[PDB]
Design a protein around this ligand. Structure first.
Ligand SMILES: Nc1ncnc2c1ncn2[C@@H]1O[C@H](COP(=O)(O)OP(=O)(O)OP(=O)(O)O)[C@@H](O)[C@H]1O
Ligand SMILES: [Mg+2]
Lengths: 368, 66
């Protein structure tokens, strides 16, 4: 008798479970239909309050209006520069939002910088120490700075030949410090809309101040930091003004990277904006050996590898050149169908990358 | 090598190809006749790992072409 009872009871249980699921989609349908009745609200930044009731709000890029708080919102918190939402019928203020992220700035913060560590970067121990003293120590350990009274340097700029690792160094700093990191190619900040770039960089610095401890990195800064087309200079003025707005308390730091520091306008080169300069020169003999060891580490070689002879031959090479040496040795192995790599592959790769650098008619490069 | 906008475009090309997590599965191929013009910016070993010279076609190469 228990089989029929179990059949009907299990059917009942399954039916009630399906009924709970069905009531769930019913509630979802009612919730989204109730949502459909909702009406959006116009966003906008605020301005001077004339009285305890009437305020001036600059509705987005549109015109500014004289409006009022609804009835219940705060009055002391509404100061010039608070993002507020406005009704589209009487334009009154309700639901004053914290601030805008400017989704581009969202992208430049939550962008993967890699798992690079200080170990993976080699040959710049002096530069790594300087940068960590300028950007890491003031952030992680401020009490030394405030008690001692030292104004921490606002930012540091990195210059050198292409492929020396400035960007790699910035990536390592981003990856190893548990913080909020901002990186954006300078060329991308420039926009064809009127004055959009100045508002872009203003909102980037506002986000950095909002999301301390925040770190903003500049690569190819000479795109906009170049010597005095019109919007470039207009946004450079905004850059100078905004980063002159760094208050001593702020846990925000600046890194600019470039390949032609001479083109940079001396305006940034002045003290008070960009004090500490770091030169990442072509890797030295021991530096080249260290970089080569780092890059050839994970490869599956067989037998002894004479890194010293390679470093003897690899004159004028940069870190990217050594990475190419490793890659071309790997490709000689892959063409020869060796499951491994030998010293001869590294030899051939060094010679090949040397012929490639022959093409590299690198013009002499000069600091700031 | 170093208008201003062409510079901006080529800087964007440089950093969408070498900096801050490139690669995944995008491979670029570059062709030009004036390699002396480009010099310092793009030709970096990190950016264009291979530099493939196309020589003046050889005797047997010319015969094969015809
Ligand atoms: N000292 C080094 N140790 C290890 N790898 C290095 C070193 N220097 C350069 N490299 C490698 O060479 C390449 C250079 O890339 P990167 O963009 O960091 O160069 P860069 O000199 O900072 O150029 P740019 O300022 O134009 O971005 C990277 O793949 C990096 O891993
Ligand atoms: Mg760089």
């Amino acid at each position: 008798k228990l089989l029929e009872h179990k059949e009907i009871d299990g059917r009942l249980k399954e039916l009630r479970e399906q009924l709970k699921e069905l009531t769930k989609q019913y509630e979802k349908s009612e919730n989204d239909l109730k949502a459909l009745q909702s009406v959006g609200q116009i966003v906008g930044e605020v301005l001077k309050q004339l009285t305890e009731e009437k305020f001036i709000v600059k509705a987005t890029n549109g015109p500014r209006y004289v409006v009022g708080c609804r009835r219940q919102l705060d009055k002391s918190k509404l100061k010039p520069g608070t993002r507020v939402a406005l009704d589209m019928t009487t334009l009154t203020i309700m639901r004053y939002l914290p601030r805008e992220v400017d989704p581009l700035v969202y992208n430049m913060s939550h962008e993967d910088p890699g798992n690079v560590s200080y170990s993976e970067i080699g040959g710049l121990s002096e530069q790594i120490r300087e940068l960590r003293e300028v950007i890491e120590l003031p952030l992680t350990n401020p009490e030394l700075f405030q008690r001692v009274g030292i104004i921490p340097p606002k930012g540091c700029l990195l210059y050198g030949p292409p492929g020396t690792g400035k960007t790699l160094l910035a990536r390592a700093v981003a990856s190893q410090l548990d913080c909020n990191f901002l990186k954006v190619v300078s060329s991308s900040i420039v926009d064809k809309y009127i004055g959009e770039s100045a508002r872009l960089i203003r909102e980037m610095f506002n986000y950095a101040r909002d999301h301390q401890p925040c770190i903003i990195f500049m690569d190819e800064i000479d795109a906009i930091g170049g010597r005095r087309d019109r919007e470039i200079q207009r946004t450079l003025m905004e850059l100078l003004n905004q980063m002159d707005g760094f208050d001593t308390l702020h846990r925000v730091k600046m890194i600019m990277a470039t390949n032609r520091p001479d083109t940079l306008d001396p305006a940034l080169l002045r003290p008070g904006r960009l004090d500490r300069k770091i030169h990442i020169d072509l890797p030295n003999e021991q530096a080249r050996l260290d970089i080569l060891k780092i890059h050839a580490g994970p490869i599956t070689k067989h037998g002894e590898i004479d890194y010293e002879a390679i470093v003897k031959l690899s004159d004028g090479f940069n870190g990217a050149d050594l990475r190419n040496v490793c890659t071309e040795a790997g490709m000689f192995a892959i063409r020869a169908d060796h499951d491994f790599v030998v010293q001869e592959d590294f030899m051939k790769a060094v010679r090949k990358v040397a012929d490639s650098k022959k093409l590299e008619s690198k013009l002499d490069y000069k600091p700031v | 090598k170093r208008d201003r906008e062409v510079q901006r475009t080529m800087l964007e090309l440089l950093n969408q190809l070498d900096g801050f997590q490139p690669n995944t599965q995008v491979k670029v191929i570059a062709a030009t006749n004036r390699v002396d013009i480009l010099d310092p910016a793009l030709l970096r070993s990190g950016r264009l790992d291979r530099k493939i010279e196309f020589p003046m076609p050889n005797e047997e190469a010319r015969a094969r072409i015809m």
